[PDB]
């Protein structure tokens, strides 16, 4: 009978809610009431990268924190040199509807995907010297939303058919599949030790996955609308999400509940991207009002504004050593802030 | 030593990007949208994953995309098509049961935040079936739309066919002109299953849209 199963499911949901309520005793805001404010964080544009014809959806930094890759809707991948603004490479793509890009940890490969439902891997260091397609990973049903390189051989991708997958680039078959989401999976974030990852969906839900065991461990709720971005804390025991209700929230894996929310009355536009600084003290979030705000993670008080873009901010990333932050936008211009 | 090689590579990439810029600015992009019942596939085949179609009229290149490999929920991937010249909307006017679904989809597209600057070209397809159904006087329209009982025409078979055609067109135009910022319009056309003027109609409508954009840009509007 379906009715008894539904009653049992809601009974377990009530039990989980009661356990979470009992496990909470204090709030993070009151614990951090005795620390000093960060102050006014003023950042200036140090570089402006020009050359993209159309709007930008994705970018990714390199491990050396010098070269980065950006994807655009005219159908081009460009590898930059943020020190001198020289275009190292320019890769023309087969499909112009590209929604994501990735940079290999070893720096030999890049990947991209979009409405074509196919993820393609490019070899930047071929023996001849040119850039050619190395593999085309097919098997997803919806559009590709995000992809991340575990290492030179394994890549994890999320699609719009409410599933994630783990690929083997050498052979091209799906090693593992992750299921359980109800809406489109919009973003994923790998753990610092690359043993777990999270994923946000259009169901206002986030889940924690085990790469080896291949099952969902925990599920976190609290948002009221679709989730657009997600990012791990530097120590690997927390993450932050950005949604369409114009709020961000910080979740803790061990406590298995929300810790703090970052919102203001004057903001009515959703968040398109989030990121953390090197030490985790500052949280940077992009908004639909053409601005990016800098938050105080331990205080939930705004501390800075970046106002250099004339259109929607789509992507935002911070280098490994935290020397700079790069933000792309829908007006086809990248900017390095410091 | 490496600076000279880096500069030479940058210059080569800039030249290639300039050529690509010229080629990209040359052409125009369109989005073909509709339902399964509507004969949009037949339309795109008449002037013939994502089904691209390139046609050229008066030495001007047009590009049309018909995405069909996705799921039912389209509120997230629809934001990739906010820079197109126009949206082609195809409606099967002979099916009264699913006309309100078309009206709701049109309202959702018209009132979107990122699609509030894109003009829509409306095609009211399947005219012969509508004429046959109206003449055969078996399935009535008044019971689906009770407002049809107090409507007067503002075709050759009878005035009733004209009345029905313009009633449906007026429904769509009322939704269009209800809420608007005078930044985008709607161009309704009456097309049948077999016609050869769709390319010319698209050319004229796109020319009007572009001219209006240029007038606004040059402060004349």
């Amino acid at each position, epitope marked *: 009978e379906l009715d008894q199963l539904r009653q049992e499911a809601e009974q377990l949901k009530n039990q989980i809610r009661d356990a979470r309520k009992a496990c909470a005793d204090a709030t993070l805001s009151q614990i951090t009431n005795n620390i000093d404010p960060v102050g006014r964080i003023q950042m200036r544009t140090r570089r402006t990268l020009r050359g993209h014809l159309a709007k930008i959806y994705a970018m990714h930094w390199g491990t050396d924190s010098r070269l980065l890759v950006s994807a655009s809707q005219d159908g081009k991948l460009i590898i930059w040199d943020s020190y001198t603004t020289n275009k190292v490479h320019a890769i023309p793509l087969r499909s112009s509807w590209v929604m994501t890009c990735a940079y290999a940890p070893s720096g030999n490969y890049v990947a991209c995907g979009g409405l074509d439902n196919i993820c393609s891997i490019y070899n930047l260091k071929t023996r001849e010297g040119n850039v050619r397609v190395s593999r085309e990973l097919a098997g997803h049903t919806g559009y590709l939303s995000c992809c991340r390189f575990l290492d030179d051989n394994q890549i994890v991708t999320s699609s719009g058919d409410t599933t994630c997958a783990l690929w083997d680039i050498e052979t091209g078959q799906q090693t593992t599949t992750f299921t359980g989401h109800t809406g489109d999976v919009m973003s994923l974030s790998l753990a610092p030790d690359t043993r777990l990852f999270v994923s946000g969906a259009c169901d206002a839900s986030a889940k924690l996955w085990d790469v080896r065991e291949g099952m969902c461990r925990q599920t976190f709720t609290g948002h009221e609308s679709d989730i657009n971005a997600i990012c791990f804390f530097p120590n690997g025991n927390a993450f932050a999400t950005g949604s369409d209700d114009a709020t961000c929230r910080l979740f803790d894996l061990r406590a298995d509940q929300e810790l703090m929310t970052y919102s203001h009355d004057n903001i*009515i536009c959703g968040i398109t991207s989030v990121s953390f600084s090197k030490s985790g003290r500052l949280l940077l979030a992009g908004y639909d009002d053409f601005n990016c705000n800098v938050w105080d993670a331990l205080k939930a008080d705004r501390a800075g504004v970046l106002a250099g873009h004339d259109n929607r901010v789509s992507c935002l990333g911070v280098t490994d050593d935290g020397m700079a932050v790069a933000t792309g936008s829908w007006d086809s211009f990248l900017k390095i802030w410091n | 030593n490496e600076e000279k090689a880096q500069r030479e590579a940058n210059k080569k990439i800039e030249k290639q990007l300039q050529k690509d810029k010229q080629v990209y600015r040359a052409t125009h992009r369109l989005l073909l949208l509709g339902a399964d019942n509507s004969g949009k596939s037949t339309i795109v085949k008449q002037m013939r994953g994502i089904f691209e179609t390139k046609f050229q009229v008066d030495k001007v290149n047009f590009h049309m995309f018909d995405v069909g490999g996705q799921r039912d929920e*389209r*509120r997230k991937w629809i934001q990739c098509f906010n820079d197109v010249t126009a949206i082609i909307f195809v409606v099967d006017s002979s099916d009264y049961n699913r006309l309100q679904e078309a009206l709701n989809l049109f309202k959702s597209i018209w*009132n979107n935040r990122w699609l509030r600057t894109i003009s829509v070209i409306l095609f009211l397809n399947k005219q012969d079936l509508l004429a046959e159904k109206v003449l055969a006087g078996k399935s009535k329209i008044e019971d689906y739309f009770p407002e049809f009982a107090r409507y007067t025409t503002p075709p050759g078979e009878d005035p009733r066919v004209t009345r029905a055609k313009y009633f449906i067109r007026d429904e769509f135009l009322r939704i269009s002109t209800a809420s608007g910022d005078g930044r985008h319009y709607c161009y309704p056309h009456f097309t049948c299953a077999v016609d050869t003027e769709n390319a010319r109609r698209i050319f004229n409508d796109c020319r009007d849209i572009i001219q209006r954009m240029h007038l606004r840009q040059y402060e004349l509007l």
Partner: nanobody, 126 residues
Framework: QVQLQESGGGLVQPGGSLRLSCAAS????????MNWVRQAPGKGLEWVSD????????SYTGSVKGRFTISRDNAKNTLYLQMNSLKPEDTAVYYC?????????????????????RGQGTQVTV
């Protein structure tokens, strides 16, 4: 999480009356546009009515005009549908849908097969 529970179904003779109520929780009710959706047996999801954020604008489908009335109570976070002069073609399961995003006036995908912010449904038979 978003929770929408509907109640009010039952057996009604033709020409009778019936009232449907939906209790909403887990989100701010006053920032969202609410819908009523029904699904007849052997037929897909069909839109019925919607009401604005404050109830200023009300619209219905063609076949229910003059018989159905939709209202919302922001004070207690409830939605209502007042059925009148029921017909044998009105038998279906009634779902209450929600606008995906706040402060907007467009509603994508409320009638989809796997919409997330939709209720379990109640059975109405005449």
């Amino acid at each position: 999480q978003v929770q929408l529970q509907e109640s009010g179904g039952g057996l009604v003779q033709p020409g009778g009356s019936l009232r449907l109520s939906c209790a909403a929780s887990g989100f701010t009710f006053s920032n969202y546009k609410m819908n009523w959706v029904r699904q007849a047996p052997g037929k897909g999801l069909e839109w019925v009515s919607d009401i604005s954020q404050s109830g200023a604008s009300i619209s219905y489908t063609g076949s229910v005009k003059g018989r159905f009335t939709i209202s919302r109570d922001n004070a207690k976070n409830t939605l209502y549908l007042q059925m009148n002069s029921l017909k044998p073609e009105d038998t279906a399961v009634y779902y209450c849908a929600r606008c995906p995003a706040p402060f907007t006036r467009d509603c994508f995908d409320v009638t989809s097969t796997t919409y997330a912010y939709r209720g379990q449904g109640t059975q109405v038979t005449v």
